[PDB]
Amino acid sequence: AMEVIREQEFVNQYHYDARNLEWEEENGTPKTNFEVTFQLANRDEAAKVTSIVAVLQFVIVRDEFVISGVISQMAHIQGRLINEPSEFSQDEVENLAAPLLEIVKRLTYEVTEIALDRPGVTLEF
Amino acid sequence: AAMEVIREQEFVNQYHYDARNLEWEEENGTPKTNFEVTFQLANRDEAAKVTSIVAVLQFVIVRDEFVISGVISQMAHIQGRLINEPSEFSQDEVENLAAPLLEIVKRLTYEVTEIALDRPGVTLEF
Numbered sequence A: 001a002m003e004v005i006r007e008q009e010f011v012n013q014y015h016y017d018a019r020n021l022e023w024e025e026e027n028g029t030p031k032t033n034f035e036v037t038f039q040l041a042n043r044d045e046a047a048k049v050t051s052i053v054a055v056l057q058f059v060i061v062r063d064e065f066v067i068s069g070v071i072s073q074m075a076h077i078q079g080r081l082i083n084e085p086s087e088f089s090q091d092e093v094e095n096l097a098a099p100l101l102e103i104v105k106r107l108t109y110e111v112t113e114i115a116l117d118r119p120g121v122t123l124e125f
Numbered sequence B: 001a002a003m004e005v006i007r008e009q010e011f012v013n014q015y016h017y018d019a020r021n022l023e024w025e026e027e028n029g030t031p032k033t034n035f036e037v038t039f040q041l042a043n044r045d046e047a048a049k050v051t052s053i054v055a056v057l058q059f060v061i062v063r064d065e066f067v068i069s070g071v072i073s074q075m076a077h078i079q080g081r082l083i084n085e086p087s088e089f090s091q092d093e094v095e096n097l098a099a100p101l102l103e104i105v106k107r108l109t110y111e112v113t114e115i116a117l118d119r120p121g122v123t124l125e126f
Helices: A021-027 A090-115 B022-028 B091-118
Strands: A004-006 A010-018 A033-044 A049-061 A065-078 B004-007 B011-019 B034-044 B050-063 B066-079
Touching: A004 A090, A010 A090, A010 B091, A033 A090, A049 A090, A065 A090, A090 B011, A090 B091, B004 B091, B011 B091, B034 B091, B050 B091, B066 B091
Parallel strands: none
Antiparallel strands: A004 A065, A010 A065, A010 B011, A033 A049, A049 A065, B004 B066, B011 B066, B034 B050, B050 B066
16 A cells, blocks of 8 residues: 655635535436546655645535535655656546545535534445 | 524535735736625515525635635525515624634635645634
8 A cells, every 4th residue: 555644634625515406407417426536746766756736526426416626636646756647546546536435425524413413424435 | 683594504605715925926816815795685584574585705814825716505595574675674683693614714724724634723803
Protein backbone atom coordinates (compact mmCIF):
# COMPACT_ATOMS: atom_id res chain seq x y z
CA ALA A 1 0.00 0.00 0.00
CA MET A 2 1.03 3.52 -0.94
CA GLU A 3 2.36 5.85 1.76
CA VAL A 4 0.83 9.31 1.65
CA ILE A 5 1.13 12.43 3.83
CA ARG A 6 -2.03 14.46 3.33
CA GLU A 7 -2.92 18.09 3.82
CA GLN A 8 -6.28 19.18 5.30
CA GLU A 9 -9.27 18.12 3.14
CA PHE A 10 -10.72 21.10 1.25
CA VAL A 11 -14.51 21.38 0.75
CA ASN A 12 -14.77 23.22 -2.57
CA GLN A 13 -18.54 22.72 -2.68
CA TYR A 14 -21.37 20.93 -0.84
CA HIS A 15 -24.92 21.44 -1.97
CA TYR A 16 -28.05 19.93 -0.54
CA ASP A 17 -31.12 20.46 -2.71
CA ALA A 18 -34.61 19.07 -2.11
CA ARG A 19 -35.65 17.22 -5.28
CA ASN A 20 -37.92 19.16 -7.59
CA LEU A 21 -39.83 16.75 -9.76
CA GLU A 22 -40.75 19.54 -12.22
CA TRP A 23 -37.07 20.45 -12.77
CA GLU A 24 -36.40 16.73 -13.28
CA GLU A 25 -39.24 16.53 -15.74
CA GLU A 26 -37.64 19.35 -17.82
CA ASN A 27 -33.92 18.40 -17.33
CA GLY A 28 -33.85 14.66 -16.55
CA THR A 29 -33.83 12.57 -13.39
CA PRO A 30 -30.40 13.07 -11.78
CA LYS A 31 -28.10 10.01 -11.43
CA THR A 32 -25.83 9.21 -8.49
CA ASN A 33 -22.21 9.45 -9.66
CA PHE A 34 -18.67 9.83 -8.20
CA GLU A 35 -15.64 10.85 -10.25
CA VAL A 36 -12.11 11.06 -8.83
CA THR A 37 -9.63 13.05 -10.92
CA PHE A 38 -6.21 14.57 -10.19
CA GLN A 39 -4.30 17.87 -10.42
CA LEU A 40 -0.48 17.19 -10.46
CA ALA A 41 1.51 19.68 -8.27
CA ASN A 42 5.14 18.45 -8.54
CA ARG A 43 7.60 15.63 -8.41
CA ASP A 44 10.48 16.13 -6.02
CA GLU A 45 13.19 13.94 -7.58
CA ALA A 46 15.61 14.40 -4.72
CA ALA A 47 13.01 13.39 -2.08
CA LYS A 48 11.20 10.87 -4.32
CA VAL A 49 7.84 12.46 -3.46
CA THR A 50 4.99 13.23 -5.82
CA SER A 51 2.58 15.95 -4.76
CA ILE A 52 -0.84 15.75 -6.43
CA VAL A 53 -4.30 17.15 -5.60
CA ALA A 54 -7.01 14.47 -5.60
CA VAL A 55 -10.46 15.79 -6.52
CA LEU A 56 -13.82 14.15 -5.85
CA GLN A 57 -16.82 15.42 -7.69
CA PHE A 58 -20.14 13.83 -6.68
CA VAL A 59 -23.87 13.76 -7.26
CA ILE A 60 -25.83 11.59 -4.80
CA VAL A 61 -29.54 11.13 -5.48
CA ARG A 62 -31.91 9.95 -2.75
CA ASP A 63 -35.68 10.01 -2.35
CA GLU A 64 -36.09 13.52 -1.02
CA PHE A 65 -32.85 15.20 -2.02
CA VAL A 66 -29.81 15.45 -4.25
CA ILE A 67 -26.41 16.16 -2.82
CA SER A 68 -23.62 17.43 -5.07
CA GLY A 69 -20.23 19.01 -4.83
CA VAL A 70 -16.50 18.71 -4.91
CA ILE A 71 -13.99 17.87 -2.20
CA SER A 72 -10.19 17.99 -2.71
CA GLN A 73 -6.93 17.25 -0.94
CA MET A 74 -3.25 17.74 -1.56
CA ALA A 75 -1.43 14.44 -1.21
CA HIS A 76 2.33 13.96 -0.90
CA ILE A 77 3.06 10.39 -2.02
CA GLN A 78 6.24 9.11 -0.43
CA GLY A 79 8.87 7.05 -2.22
CA ARG A 80 7.13 7.45 -5.56
CA LEU A 81 7.66 9.57 -8.70
CA ILE A 82 4.54 9.60 -10.83
CA ASN A 83 3.99 11.45 -14.09
CA GLU A 84 0.34 10.93 -14.70
CA PRO A 85 -2.75 9.54 -12.98
CA SER A 86 -3.23 6.77 -15.58
CA GLU A 87 -0.32 5.26 -13.67
CA PHE A 88 -2.50 4.75 -10.55
CA SER A 89 -4.01 1.31 -9.84
CA GLN A 90 -7.73 1.13 -8.83
CA ASP A 91 -6.61 0.49 -5.17
CA GLU A 92 -4.37 3.56 -5.28
CA VAL A 93 -7.15 5.79 -6.64
CA GLU A 94 -9.41 4.39 -3.88
CA ASN A 95 -6.71 5.05 -1.27
CA LEU A 96 -6.22 8.70 -2.42
CA ALA A 97 -10.02 9.24 -2.61
CA ALA A 98 -10.92 7.62 0.75
CA PRO A 99 -10.60 10.77 2.88
CA LEU A 100 -12.73 12.70 0.33
CA LEU A 101 -15.63 10.26 0.39
CA GLU A 102 -15.49 10.27 4.19
CA ILE A 103 -16.01 14.07 4.27
CA VAL A 104 -18.97 13.52 1.97
CA LYS A 105 -20.24 10.77 4.30
CA ARG A 106 -19.82 13.06 7.42
CA LEU A 107 -21.47 16.14 5.78
CA THR A 108 -24.32 14.04 4.47
CA TYR A 109 -25.14 12.24 7.74
CA GLU A 110 -25.29 15.55 9.66
CA VAL A 111 -27.11 17.55 7.00
CA THR A 112 -29.76 14.88 6.39
CA GLU A 113 -30.32 14.32 10.12
CA ILE A 114 -31.17 18.00 10.61
CA ALA A 115 -32.91 18.57 7.26
CA LEU A 116 -35.18 15.49 7.32
CA ASP A 117 -35.57 15.20 11.10
CA ARG A 118 -34.61 11.60 11.13
CA PRO A 119 -31.42 9.76 11.83
CA GLY A 120 -28.72 10.82 9.41
CA VAL A 121 -28.37 8.97 6.14
CA THR A 122 -25.19 6.90 6.10
CA LEU A 123 -23.66 6.54 2.64
CA GLU A 124 -21.93 3.31 1.83
CA PHE A 125 -20.19 3.37 -1.57
CA ALA B 1 -50.92 35.79 25.63
CA ALA B 2 -48.74 34.23 22.93
CA MET B 3 -49.78 32.88 19.54
CA GLU B 4 -50.73 29.17 19.41
CA VAL B 5 -49.08 27.46 16.43
CA ILE B 6 -49.04 23.84 15.25
CA ARG B 7 -46.12 23.37 12.82
CA GLU B 8 -45.18 20.90 10.14
CA GLN B 9 -41.64 19.71 9.82
CA GLU B 10 -39.20 22.34 8.51
CA PHE B 11 -38.53 21.90 4.78
CA VAL B 12 -35.03 22.54 3.49
CA ASN B 13 -35.37 23.60 -0.14
CA GLN B 14 -31.67 24.45 -0.60
CA TYR B 15 -28.63 24.54 1.62
CA HIS B 16 -25.47 25.47 -0.30
CA TYR B 17 -21.86 25.61 0.97
CA ASP B 18 -19.29 27.07 -1.33
CA ALA B 19 -15.62 27.81 -0.68
CA ARG B 20 -14.89 31.50 -1.00
CA ASN B 21 -13.76 32.52 -4.50
CA LEU B 22 -12.31 36.04 -4.28
CA GLU B 23 -11.20 36.13 -7.97
CA TRP B 24 -14.88 35.98 -9.02
CA GLU B 25 -16.71 38.01 -6.33
CA GLU B 26 -14.27 40.93 -6.84
CA GLU B 27 -16.03 41.91 -10.12
CA ASN B 28 -19.26 39.87 -9.61
CA GLY B 29 -20.23 41.54 -6.27
CA THR B 30 -19.11 40.96 -2.64
CA PRO B 31 -21.98 39.42 -0.59
CA LYS B 32 -23.33 40.51 2.79
CA THR B 33 -24.68 38.14 5.36
CA ASN B 34 -28.49 38.61 5.33
CA PHE B 35 -31.80 36.89 5.93
CA GLU B 36 -35.25 37.65 4.45
CA VAL B 37 -38.37 36.05 5.92
CA THR B 38 -41.77 36.19 4.33
CA PHE B 39 -45.13 34.68 5.17
CA GLN B 40 -47.79 33.36 2.84
CA LEU B 41 -51.44 32.54 3.46
CA ALA B 42 -51.82 28.95 2.37
CA ASN B 43 -55.42 28.59 3.46
CA ARG B 44 -58.13 28.54 6.13
CA ASP B 45 -60.63 26.66 8.23
CA GLU B 46 -62.69 29.61 9.47
CA ALA B 47 -65.24 27.23 11.02
CA ALA B 48 -62.29 25.72 12.94
CA LYS B 49 -60.59 29.17 13.48
CA VAL B 50 -57.26 28.33 11.75
CA THR B 51 -54.94 30.14 9.35
CA SER B 52 -52.29 28.03 7.61
CA ILE B 53 -49.23 30.06 6.68
CA VAL B 54 -46.02 29.21 4.77
CA ALA B 55 -42.96 30.92 6.33
CA VAL B 56 -40.01 31.13 3.94
CA LEU B 57 -36.48 32.10 4.96
CA GLN B 58 -33.94 32.99 2.32
CA PHE B 59 -30.39 33.48 3.52
CA VAL B 60 -26.77 34.27 2.69
CA ILE B 61 -23.91 33.90 5.22
CA VAL B 62 -20.46 35.21 4.20
CA ARG B 63 -17.29 34.41 6.18
CA ASP B 64 -13.63 34.59 5.10
CA GLU B 65 -13.67 30.90 4.13
CA PHE B 66 -17.10 30.50 2.60
CA VAL B 67 -20.46 31.59 1.40
CA ILE B 68 -23.45 29.60 2.59
CA SER B 69 -26.85 30.21 0.99
CA GLY B 70 -30.30 28.68 0.81
CA VAL B 71 -34.03 28.62 1.42
CA ILE B 72 -35.94 26.99 4.26
CA SER B 73 -39.75 26.80 4.50
CA GLN B 74 -42.22 25.73 7.13
CA MET B 75 -45.96 25.24 7.19
CA ALA B 76 -47.54 26.82 10.31
CA HIS B 77 -51.17 26.26 11.34
CA ILE B 78 -52.11 29.28 13.48
CA GLN B 79 -54.79 28.37 16.09
CA GLY B 80 -57.57 30.82 17.04
CA ARG B 81 -56.73 33.36 14.32
CA LEU B 82 -58.27 34.32 11.01
CA ILE B 83 -55.74 36.44 9.18
CA ASN B 84 -56.75 38.19 5.99
CA GLU B 85 -53.28 39.53 5.14
CA PRO B 86 -49.76 38.69 6.52
CA SER B 87 -49.04 42.30 7.61
CA GLU B 88 -51.52 41.72 10.47
CA PHE B 89 -48.72 39.87 12.26
CA SER B 90 -46.92 41.76 15.01
CA GLN B 91 -43.15 41.87 15.37
CA ASP B 92 -43.28 39.22 18.11
CA GLU B 93 -45.53 37.05 15.93
CA VAL B 94 -43.06 37.30 13.04
CA GLU B 95 -40.21 36.55 15.48
CA ASN B 96 -42.16 33.49 16.73
CA LEU B 97 -42.94 32.28 13.22
CA ALA B 98 -39.37 32.78 11.87
CA ALA B 99 -37.49 31.26 14.85
CA PRO B 100 -37.61 27.59 13.80
CA LEU B 101 -36.32 28.49 10.33
CA LEU B 102 -33.37 30.40 11.76
CA GLU B 103 -32.63 27.54 14.26
CA ILE B 104 -32.40 25.07 11.32
CA VAL B 105 -29.91 27.32 9.51
CA LYS B 106 -27.98 27.63 12.77
CA ARG B 107 -27.80 23.81 13.24
CA LEU B 108 -26.90 23.15 9.61
CA THR B 109 -24.17 25.81 9.65
CA TYR B 110 -22.60 24.55 12.85
CA GLU B 111 -22.24 20.91 11.65
CA VAL B 112 -21.16 21.80 8.13
CA THR B 113 -18.51 24.40 9.16
CA GLU B 114 -17.30 22.08 11.94
CA ILE B 115 -16.65 19.39 9.31
CA ALA B 116 -15.59 21.61 6.36
CA LEU B 117 -13.05 23.72 8.24
CA ASP B 118 -12.18 21.35 10.98
CA ARG B 119 -12.04 24.05 13.49
CA PRO B 120 -14.88 24.71 15.86
CA GLY B 121 -18.23 25.01 14.19
CA VAL B 122 -19.53 28.48 13.43
CA THR B 123 -22.34 29.41 15.82
CA LEU B 124 -24.73 32.00 14.32
CA GLU B 125 -26.54 34.45 16.61
CA PHE B 126 -29.18 36.57 14.84
